[PDB]
Structures are given as C-alpha cells and as structure tokens.
Structure 1
Amino acid sequence: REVKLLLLGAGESGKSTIVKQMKIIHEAGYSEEECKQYKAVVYSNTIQSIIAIIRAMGRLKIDFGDAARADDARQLFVLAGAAEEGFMTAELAGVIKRLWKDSGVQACFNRSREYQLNDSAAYYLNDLDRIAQPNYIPTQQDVLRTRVKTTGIVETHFTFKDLHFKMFDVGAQRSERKKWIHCFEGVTAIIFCVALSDYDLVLAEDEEMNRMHESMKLFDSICNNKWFTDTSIILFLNKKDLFEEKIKKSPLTICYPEYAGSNTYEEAAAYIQCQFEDLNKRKDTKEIYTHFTCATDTKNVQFVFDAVTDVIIKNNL
C-alpha cells in the first residue's frame, strides 16, 4: 500500500528537519561527501547568527563587555561584507570566538526573543572550534541543525513495514493558501508541526504578532477543513528540548495571559496541547494524535514515527 503524508506547519517548525531524518532513518543517510555540501551552510548559518546578535545590541543599546570587541565587531563586517559565500578562516574564527565569549554579547543573546535569531545559533557558536577546522566536514547533527528555507515542494519516498510512504513538504506559504491546499484532498495523514519554543516570540515583519497564535490560527484552518475529514491529523509539538530550557525562565503567560497553572515543563506543555486540540470542532468524529518531538534527535523521531505508522495502519490503509 502507498501512504501519502503532508507535512504542514508555520515557518521554522521543523518540517524540513523531519524530511532529513527520514533519509537518515529510513534511507541511505548523509554520507561524507553529502555532508561536505552542507559545510558552507554551516558557515553561512554561523556568520549570520553572530551578526544578528552583534546588530541587536545596537537596537537594544547593550554595550560590549571589553571595548576591544568593538574592533572585532568591525572586523566581522570586513570579512563577512567581503566574501560572497559562507566560508571560514582562522581569523574569522578568532573574531567570532572573542565576540561570542563577550559579556555584552551574551547579555544580548539572553534577550534573543526580542529579535530574530536562528535556534541553532548557540550550537554552532559553541562548537566553533570544531567547525572552524581547515578540513571540517559537517556531522549528521550539524546538517540537521542547518537552516535552509524551502522554496519548492519537497518529496520523499521511503518504505517502512512494507508500506511505502510519500512525504510532501510544501512550506508555510502554501500551507496557508486556502484554495490551493485542495489538491491534497485525499491524503492519508497530515503531520502538523508546531514550534513549542515560539510561545514568547513574534514574527520579524509583524513585530507584534505572536507566532504560537499564528500557528494556532493555521491549525484551526487545516484541522476543521472539509477536505481532510478522512485524513489523520497528527500534531508534532516540536522543539520540546528548547521549550524545556525556556519555560523555566519565560512564563507561558506571555503567550496565554489567562494561563493560571504553574510554569513547569509538565503543566505548560499540557496547556499548549489542550489549546491546540480544543480548536478541533469534530471532537467526537475526528481525533487528533499529538506527539512531543525533538526533530533534531534521530532516536526520538524514530520512536515517534514508529508510533505514527502504527496508527495509520490501524485506520487508513
């Protein structure tokens, strides 16, 4: 039997990361010369991150720890504002390192929810030593941590338990177009990704628009859509790892001011899940299968996917 799966969700929820984990888990996986191709992305990824922080400092009027950094900051722009593609040198590595290591820098980094920063910023910045290597080759985790925006519709074929899957990743824009999505009227299952850590975040170009709510508006659209009456809706409340470290420092009340429970991973996450499930009108007839995930963790995605495939077998094939 063939099974079609539509990955839906706002931008940066984990959709393309899940696609990657399918290749790693169910297919060949990323080879040594495959990862070498993402080496440039790792560089571009890291360079942009530090630049965003260095730039927010201005915006938030935060000052460097050591004033010697001001010079490093300038040097960052001379090297970055020169090259045309993500590269890395021993000099670029020192400037970045000294900057990351700075006090004012970390302060601005602790205020990241005030600007736009890639989730993977700390990961690469903290491993700059390793990725700065002259003959560095990205590891699988480095590839999963990259951020490449999806222009086209990505598709993946993989077999699993004598069931052949065809995964479609259409990206945020199209996830949103209410008419267009009709072409997928008969999908077996839709996997909806939600970024848990966005709860205290806005959209860059919509500075006052909370992302968790924008994603709730989209769940509501897909969820209660006539074309998916017979499609299983699976919810990946993704980035459980970042939510954990965040919740204990930023209150959910920033997202849902009416929240009254406590701010622990357990209560807050359960609240988020209920909020999304409740948007489902066909509560009787239609069922939502929710899972908490860490898309960058291959083992987690693997166990969760095993589960998902067992449900689809139970009612859709």
Structure 2
Amino acid sequence: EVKLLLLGAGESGKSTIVKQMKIIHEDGYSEDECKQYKVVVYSNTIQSIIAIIRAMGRLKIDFGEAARADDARQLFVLAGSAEEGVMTPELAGVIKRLWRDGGVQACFSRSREYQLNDSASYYLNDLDRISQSNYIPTQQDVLRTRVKTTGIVETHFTFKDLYFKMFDVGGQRSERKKWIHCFEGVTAIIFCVALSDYDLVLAEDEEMNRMHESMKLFDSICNNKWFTETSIILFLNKKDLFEEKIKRSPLTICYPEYTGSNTYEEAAAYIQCQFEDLNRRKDTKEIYTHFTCATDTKNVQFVFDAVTDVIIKNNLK
C-alpha cells in the first residue's frame, strides 16, 4: 500500500494528473462520464471568452469591428443558456465572431495582464466541434477542463501489485491550512509546478509572481520533517505551454538574474535548478524531477511508470 500526495500551488495541474490515473490505471472515462463534462466545457468556454472581453474594457482595447459590440451584448444575454448543457447555434455564432475579431485576439495575446484559463484557446479554436447538438466531449476535452478543487479528495487504484491511496488537494493559499490533515506516513509526494506561470501573477494576490510562490511552497514542503523518509517527485508541468511562451516572453520577468537565452532548453534547465537548490538536505535527500504535459496521456503514462519504479526502489531500503 502506497500513500501518494498531489501537492502544488493552484492550477499547477494536480487534478489533471488525477484524471490521468483514471485513464491509465482505471478504465478511462465512459461516454456517460464524458457527457457529464459537457456543461463544464461550455462554462469554461463561455467564462474564457467573457474574461477576454472584460479585459478589453479595462485595458482599453477596441474591437476590430463595431458590429462586435452587439455580439458582446448578446454573449452576456445568453451566458446562462448553456447550464443545462446546450450551446444554441445563436450562442455559438456570437462566440465564433468574437473570437475571430482582431481586437479580441490582441487582448488574448496580452492574457498575462489578467486571469485566463490555459484551455481557453483549445476550446475556442475548436468551437465547431464543441457546438454540435450531438457533441460528446473527448478524453482530451475532459482533461482540458478547469474546475477549481476545494478540500481533500481520496482516490484508489492498483499498479504493479501496489494499492495506491492518492490525495488531491486544493492549491490556493486558503486550502493549504488543511494539508496537515493527511501528512502522516506519506510514501511519496508529487509536487506540481506550472512552468508556464513564470510571467503570471497569483489569482489570490495580483502583485505576487506565481513561480516565486510555487518555489516558496516547494521550499516548505521539500524540507518538512514529515517527509524526511518520503520520496519527493517534482513535476515541472505545462511544458507544452512553456514551449510556446518562452519564445514570446522573457524569463527575466521571473528571475531577473537569468543571463541565459530565452529558449525552451536553457530556460527549463534553469527553472529545474532553482527548485532543486531549495533542497536543504542534499547530502541525505534526492528530488526526482520530470518534465510533464499533464494533459498528454502517453507522456504521463511514461513519467508515472518511472516514478513507480523509484518508489519500489526506495521501499526496499
């Protein structure tokens, strides 16, 4: 039996990993189970396009065309229309026209300045498929959904003759006070970091850089006396988003001492070291680090197989 904690700051991808455990080591999602996410895809898709449009008002970005102002109004009129899981063709059209607009796209490019779901562009670029009356979300759609976790949620699965008790937790500051409840006898901790957060700011404090928050948190967890004998795994997640972002946005936003080049390979290396240097007991302890795309099942399957082999190694000693 193995007690596994999923920890990390909010939106680092813990719940996405939990879903992957169901996909890989339970039975996948059934069609009915996928149908239950339909409402969540639509809400995520609507709230994303709305967030962008409110941002335009704050940031003072005009629409590429005047007619979109009417589309904007109609968006809010129909915003609650999808709560029973139906996107009317009227609503689909409004969202299509808004998303195509040059002004909306200019605001989306500035997302860094406000709070926006990572999956926004994924749904919005796939609106035709998502819009159909017959629409059944795919496993990728479900993995892409955003639903803020509150509390502690226990899950069971089996892999290589081991019974995993796994704990998913909320990562926002408020939720962290509850973590102490399941710290006893922890076999392994998977700590998730959103690589793509390097230039973003916290949802709970618009002045604090998300990565620095994540490092402070990892510092606390990593060196905690509860986890002296715990295998500590680091998931530098969202590598896919990080790869697109590092071309556009310099890492010096986050680490102003960085003198290296703004390229996936160097930037990622630098981040890894920053986190691993927070290990105080380097003589004793080791961090097992993997670059993950949580929403990618083949990637998560490979990474978790390696993690499991490490756990097996460290429970002979």
- Residue in structure 1 matched with residue 254 of structure 2 by the alignment: 255
Deviations 1:173-195 (A, max 9, x none): 58964685264232110000000
Q: Judge which range, 99-108 or 151-160, deviates more.
A: 151-160
Deviations 1:55-110 (A, max 9, x none): 10011100111111111001101111566566411000000000000000000000
Asked whether the 8 Å contact 1:188–1:232 carries over to 2, the reply is yes
Distance 2:266 2:82 in 1: 47
Q: CA deviation at 1:135?
A: 1.3
Distance 1:316 1:126 in 2: 46
Deviations 1:104-147 (A, max 9, x none): 00000000000000000000000000000011110000000001
Distance 2:305 2:19 in 1: 16
Distance 1:74 1:173 in 2: 33
Asked whether the 8 Å contact 2:31–2:136 carries over to 1, the reply is yes
Evaluate the alpha carbon distance shift between residue 266 and residue 64 of structure 1 in structure 2; reply closer, same or farther with a 3 A threshold. Answer: same
Q: Judge which range, 171-180 or 274-283, deviates more.
A: 171-180
Aligned length: 316
Asked whether the 8 Å contact 2:45–2:123 carries over to 1, the reply is yes
Evaluate the alpha carbon distance shift between residue 126 and residue 31 of structure 1 in structure 2; reply closer, same or farther with a 3 A threshold. Answer: same
Q: Judge which range, 302-311 or 169-178, deviates more.
A: 169-178
Evaluate the alpha carbon distance shift between residue 153 and residue 56 of structure 1 in structure 2; reply closer, same or farther with a 3 A threshold. Answer: same
Structure 2 unmatched runs, 5+: none
Asked whether the 8 Å contact 2:39–2:82 carries over to 1, the reply is no
Distance 1:250 1:6 in 2: 32
Distance 1:34 1:236 in 2: 27
Evaluate the alpha carbon distance shift between residue 75 and residue 301 of structure 1 in structure 2; reply closer, same or farther with a 3 A threshold. Answer: same
Q: CA deviation at 1:261?
A: 0.6
Q: CA deviation at 1:171?
A: 1.6
Distance 1:83 1:240 in 2: 32
Asked whether the 8 Å contact 1:44–1:85 carries over to 2, the reply is no
**TM-score for both structures, normalised by structure 1:** 0.96
Distance 1:118 1:274 in 2: 27
Structure 1 unmatched runs, 5+: none
Q: CA deviation at 1:309?
A: 0.4
Evaluate the alpha carbon distance shift between residue 110 and residue 81 of structure 1 in structure 2; reply closer, same or farther with a 3 A threshold. Answer: same
Q: Judge which range, 32-41 or 76-85, deviates more.
A: 76-85
- Residue in structure 1 matched with residue 59 of structure 2 by the alignment: 60
Q: Confirm or deny that 1:209 pairs with 2:205.
A: no
How well do the aligned residues superpose, as a CA RMSD in angstroms? 1.6
Q: CA deviation at 1:170?
A: 1.9
Q: CA deviation at 1:41?
A: 0.2
- Residue in structure 1 matched with residue 314 of structure 2 by the alignment: 315
Q: CA deviation at 1:316?
A: 2.2
Distance 2:38 2:171 in 1: 26
- Residue in structure 1 matched with residue 198 of structure 2 by the alignment: 199
Q: CA deviation at 1:172?
A: 1.3
Evaluate the alpha carbon distance shift between residue 290 and residue 83 of structure 1 in structure 2; reply closer, same or farther with a 3 A threshold. Answer: closer
Evaluate the alpha carbon distance shift between residue 34 and residue 182 of structure 1 in structure 2; reply closer, same or farther with a 3 A threshold. Answer: closer
Q: CA deviation at 1:284?
A: 0.9
Asked whether the 8 Å contact 1:189–1:231 carries over to 2, the reply is yes
Evaluate the alpha carbon distance shift between residue 5 and residue 69 of structure 1 in structure 2; reply closer, same or farther with a 3 A threshold. Answer: same
Displacement over 2 Å in runs of 4+: 81-87, 173-180
Evaluate the alpha carbon distance shift between residue 263 and residue 89 of structure 1 in structure 2; reply closer, same or farther with a 3 A threshold. Answer: same
Distance 1:58 1:20 in 2: 36
Asked whether the 8 Å contact 2:173–2:204 carries over to 1, the reply is no
Distance 2:263 2:192 in 1: 22
Q: Judge which range, 251-260 or 146-155, deviates more.
A: 146-155
Distance 2:84 2:209 in 1: 33
Q: Judge which range, 164-173 or 70-79, deviates more.
A: 164-173
Evaluate the alpha carbon distance shift between residue 83 and residue 288 of structure 1 in structure 2; reply closer, same or farther with a 3 A threshold. Answer: closer
Evaluate the alpha carbon distance shift between residue 81 and residue 165 of structure 1 in structure 2; reply closer, same or farther with a 3 A threshold. Answer: closer
